[PDB]
Amino acid sequence: GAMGSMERASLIQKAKLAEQAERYEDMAAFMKGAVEKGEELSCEERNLLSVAYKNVVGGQRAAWRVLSSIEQKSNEGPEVREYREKVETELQGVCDTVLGLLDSHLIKEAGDAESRVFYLKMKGDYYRYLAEVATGDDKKRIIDSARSAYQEAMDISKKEMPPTNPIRLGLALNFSVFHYEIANSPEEAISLAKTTFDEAMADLHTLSEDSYKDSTLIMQLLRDNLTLWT
Amino acid sequence: GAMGSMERASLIQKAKLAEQAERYEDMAAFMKGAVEKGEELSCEERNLLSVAYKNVVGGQRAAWRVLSSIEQKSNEGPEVREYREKVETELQGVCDTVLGLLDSHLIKEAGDAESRVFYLKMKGDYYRYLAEVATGDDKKRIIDSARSAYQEAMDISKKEMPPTNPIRLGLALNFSVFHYEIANSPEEAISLAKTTFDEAMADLHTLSEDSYKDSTLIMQLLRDNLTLWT
Amino acid sequence: RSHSSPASLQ
Amino acid sequence: RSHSSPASLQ
C-alpha cells in the first residue's frame, strides 16, 4: 500500500527520521504504513502517529483559514472558492484517513486506558477538524460524532487515570476547545477548563519532577484559554 | 496536464492565493501550469515562479541536509540511506522540472535582459541545487552546467543592466555562493562579492528611495557573506 | 485562537 | 551557511 513491502520497524525508524527532517507528510505515510501492519501501537508509536497527522492537518487548517478569510472578504470569479474547496477536500481526506485507521482497527483493539483514551481523543479531534469546515446537512452530525468520542474518552479517563495524567489533561483541553469553538458552549468550555485545572493542581504533589513538568505544561494551556475566554 | 484545463489567468490568481496560504507545492504546480500555456511571463509572473519553486526545493534541501548529517554520523541498517535517497530523488525531480521549463521554452523566447538574465540565473541556481547532492560521475558536469548558466547571465547583466539592478545583484550573489560552496573557489567568491558590492555602492546615488531599498537589501547579503567568509 | 493539546502526550 | 538571493527580484 505504497508501504506494504517495508518492515514495521523500518517504517517506525523512517517516521522518526522524517520528524527530524520536518517532513510530516512522509512521517504520516510511514506511520499509516506501520498501523496497517495490524499490530497494536506502543505509547511512543501512538505519539508518532499523532505528531505526524497533527502537523499535516495543521498546515491544511492554517491554509484553509487564510483562504476562507479571503473568500469572506470577496463576499462583502470562482477561483478563491475553487481553491478553498480544493484545500478543504484535501483536509477532509486526511481527517477521513485518520478516522479510518482508528476505526480499522486501532480503537477496537485498545484495551488499556492510556491507549483507548488516546485514540478516542484523536477521534474527537479529527471530527472537530471536519466540523471546522463543515457547513451543509452534515455539520450537526459531525459535531455529534466529535462530542460522542470526546465524552467516551472523558468517562474512561475519569475512572482510570489520575487528574494530572497528560493524556487526560490534553483530552479535557481539547474537549473544552470543542465546546468553545465548535459547539457554541463557552460556559461549558470555561467550566471544564477550570475544573480540570483545579483537580490537577490538587494532584501535583504526587508527581516526580519530570511528571510535574509534563502536567504543568498542559495546565498552562488551560490557563491561557481561560485568560482568553474570560 | 492536471492544469491544462485551467485558464492562464486563473492559474496565476491561484498561485498568488497559494503564496498567501504558504501552500508552495500548489503554488509551483499552478505556475508550472501557467508556463505550459506557452506565453512568455511578465516580471511579476517570473517572480511567482521563482518564489514557488525556491520554497519547495528549500524544504527538500533542508530535509536532505538533516538526513545527510545523520547518515554521516552513522558512518563514523539501510533506512537512513534509503530515506535520504528518497528525499534526494524528489529534490532532483523538482530541479529537473524547473530546468525543463527553462529549456522548454522560457529561455529561448526571453529576449529582454531582465527576463533572459532572470531565467539564466534560475538555470544556474537549479544546477547548483543538483550539485549540492551530486556525488557520482556527473558532479563535475553538473557543476560545469551551473557555471556556464551563471556566466552567460553575468555577461548579459554587465552589458545590459546597471550595477544596482536587483536581478544583477542577486545573480552575482548566487554565483559567489556557487564559487564558495560548490566550486571550492573561495577567493573567486570573495572577489566577486566585493567587486559587486563596491560597484553597486557607487551607483546608489542614481536611485529613487524605493529602488535604493531594493538594491541595499541584496547588498547587505553580499556584506553578510563577506563577513562569514573572511 | 484557543490553544489545543500538543500532539505528543505522556 | 552562505546567504543566497531572495526568490523575488526587482
Ligand SMILES: *CCC(=O)Nc1cccc(-c2csc(C(=N)N)c2)c1
Ligand atoms: C506513554 C508513554 C510514552 O510517552 N513513551 C515514549 C517513549 C519515548 C518517546 C516518546 C515520545 C513522546 S512524543 C515523541 C516524538 N515527537 N518523537 C516521542 C514516548
Ligand SMILES: *CCC(=O)Nc1cccc(-c2csc(C(=N)N)c2)c1
Ligand atoms: C521586474 C518588474 C517587477 O518586479 N514587477 C512586479 C509587480 C508586482 C509584484 C511583483 C512581485 C515581485 S515578488 C512578488 C510575490 N512574492 N508575490 C510579486 C513584481
